[PDB]
Amino acid sequence: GVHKMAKNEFQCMANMDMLGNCEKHCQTSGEKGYCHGTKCKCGTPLSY
């Protein structure tokens, strides 16, 4: 909802956000990381 929270966008490669400050914080929780520079979040891989 409030922010892009999936593997589809930024891909830890965007030319001003690729240095995502959460490089272990996701895998240490078992969930997947998203790189928005300092606005770096993780998230569950989800199911349907």
UniProtKB/Swiss-Prot annotation:
GO terms for biological process: defense response to bacterium. One of its GO terms (molecular function) is toxin activity. Its main location: secreted. GO terms for cellular component: extracellular region; membrane; other organism cell membrane. Expressed by the venom gland. Disulfide bonds join C12-C35, C22-C40, C26-C42. Residues 9-48 form the BetaSPN-type CS-alpha/beta domain. It is found in: Secreted; Target cell membrane. It comes from the Eukaryota. Keywords: Antibiotic, Antimicrobial, Disulfide bond, Membrane, Secreted, Signal, Target cell membrane, Target membrane, Toxin. Negative results: does not inhibit potassium channels Shaker and Kv7.1/KCNQ1, when tested at lower doses than those inducing cytolytic activity (18 uM). Belongs to the long chain scorpion toxin family. Class 3 subfamily. The recombinantly expressed N-terminal domain (AA 20-47) induces cell membrane disruption, leakage currents and cell death on HEK293 cell line (tested at 25 uM). Does not inhibit potassium channels Shaker and Kv7.1/KCNQ1 (tested at 18 uM). The recombinantly expressed C-terminal domain (AA 48-94) induces cell membrane disruption, leakage currents and cell death on HEK293 cell line (tested at 25 uM). Moderately inhibits both potassium channels Shaker and Kv7.1/KCNQ1 (36% and 20%, respectively, when tested at 18 uM). This full-length protein shows antibacterial activity against B.subtilis and K.pneumoniae. Also shows a potent inhibitory effect on the ookinete (ED(50) 0.7 uM) and gamete (ED(50) 10 uM) stages of Plasmodium berghei development. In addition, induces cell membrane disruption, leakage currents and cell death on HEK293 cell line (tested at 25 uM). This is Scorpine. It comes from Pandinus imperator. The lineage of its organism: Eukaryota, Metazoa, Ecdysozoa, Arthropoda, Chelicerata.
